[PDB]
Design a protein around this nucleic acid. Structure first.
Ligand SMILES: [Mn+2]
Ligand SMILES: [Mn+2]
Ligand SMILES: [Mn+2]
Ligand SMILES: [Mn+2]
Ligand SMILES: [Mn+2]
Ligand SMILES: [Mn+2]
Ligand code: NA
Length: 325
DNA sequence: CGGCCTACG
DNA sequence: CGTAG
DNA sequence: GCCG
């Protein structure tokens, strides 16, 4: 089992769901306490289990697996023996964990803001609504729309949103294209948001495109919130006899950068962190959603496809549905 | 032990 | 500070 | 928390 998540297929559904979920609780808790290192180890350990071909049934089977040390092994051992891990359950029921989860899941609120509010004694969403002068416009939007934004986005929703984005993009720039990215490109049937990547086959014609797209969506009454290359929107999505708010991310890239942007925006988040770490540490190349840089020759790698990028990193190709690290 | 991805709004 | 995968 |  290779050490980096980008070196192994990780399907969306797998054989160790309960074990991975418990490790991901500890990862999330570590993030709420500012320990990105412990978050990463717990996330990586969970991801290893997702990549296994069958269920872990005995502690012996963790021997030699990367990212399983004393702590993560004990979590698995307790779940195997008792069906529950006291540490995990203590985290789950803790006021700190529940409140940090509630606050950080608000659009506009990160760990730093949630932590400050927690120390000020705030605990509920209505606590935040009582003092709205303290909130950013982004946070006010996240709070007004919080209920809808907590409701799963379905594939049928995604198809409807893609049609309206394509209509605005078509008027903004004939020939421009719209590609579904994020979790839905990896095969998820539901999600909490929708991600799109926009380009044009003629290099440079995409310049200035996102304002024109946003102006046209706004004029159609579809934008409940927006604040360029990346637009983090709340869309009004028609529903039977009503509508609901949906988070949509719109991203523009020139066609030269499109394979890097597609790779980056298809994720998963952990997969891309691991891929960038592998690139730099194992191959000495610097990767982001714009390109891949050789800092010795001081040159950028030209890519026409995601397959190109995997080849330039010496990695076997993984389709999106196997990037669910 | 140091590192832990790397951007944009 | 927030956002993104 | 774990790896190199
Ligand atoms: Mn420990
Ligand atoms: Mn026991
Ligand atoms: Mn997404
Ligand atoms: Mn998104
Ligand atoms: Mn750019
Ligand atoms: Mn150290
Ligand atoms: Na948030």
């Amino acid at each position: 089992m290779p050490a980096y998540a980008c070196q192994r297929p990780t399907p969306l559904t797998h054989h160790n769901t309960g074990l991975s979920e418990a490790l991901e609780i500890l990862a999330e808790a570590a993030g709420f306490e500012g320990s990105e290192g412990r978050l990463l180890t717990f996330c990586r350990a969970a991801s290893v289990l997702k990549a296994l071909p069958s269920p872990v049934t005995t502690l012996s089977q963790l021997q030699g697996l990367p990212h399983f040390g004393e702590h993560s092994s004990r979590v698995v051992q307790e779940l195997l023996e008792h069906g529950v891990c006291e540490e995990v359950e203590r985290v789950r029921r803790s006021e700190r964990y529940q409140t940090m989860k509630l606050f950080t899941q608000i659009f506009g609120v990160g760990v730093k803001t949630a932590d400050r509010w927690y120390r000020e004694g705030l605990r509920t969403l209505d606590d935040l609504r009582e003092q709205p002068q303290k909130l950013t416009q982004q946070q006010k939007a996240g709070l007004q729309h919080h209920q809808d934004l907590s409701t799963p986005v379905l594939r049928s929703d995604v198809d409807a949103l893609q049609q309206v984005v394509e209509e605005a993009v078509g008027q903004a720039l004939p020939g421009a294209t719209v590609t579904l990215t994020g979790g839905f490109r990896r095969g998820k049937l539901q999600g909490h948001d929708v991600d799109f990547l926009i380009t044009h086959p003629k290099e440079g014609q995409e310049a200035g495109l996102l304002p024109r797209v946003m102006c046209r969506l706004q004029d159609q009454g579809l934008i409940l919130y927006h604040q360029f290359e990346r637009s983090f929107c709340i869309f009004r999505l028609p529903q039977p006899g009503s509508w609901k708010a949906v988070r949509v991310d719109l991203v523009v890239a020139p066609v030269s950068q499109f394979p890097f942007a597609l790779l980056g925006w298809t994720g998963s988040k952990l997969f891309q962190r691991e891929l960038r770490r592998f690139s730099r540490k194992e191959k000495g190349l610097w990767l982001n959603s714009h390109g891949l840089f050789d800092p010795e020759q001081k040159t950028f790698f030209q890519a026409a496809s995601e397959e190109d990028i995997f080849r330039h990193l010496g990695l076997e190709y993984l389709p999106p549905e196997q990037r669910n690290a």
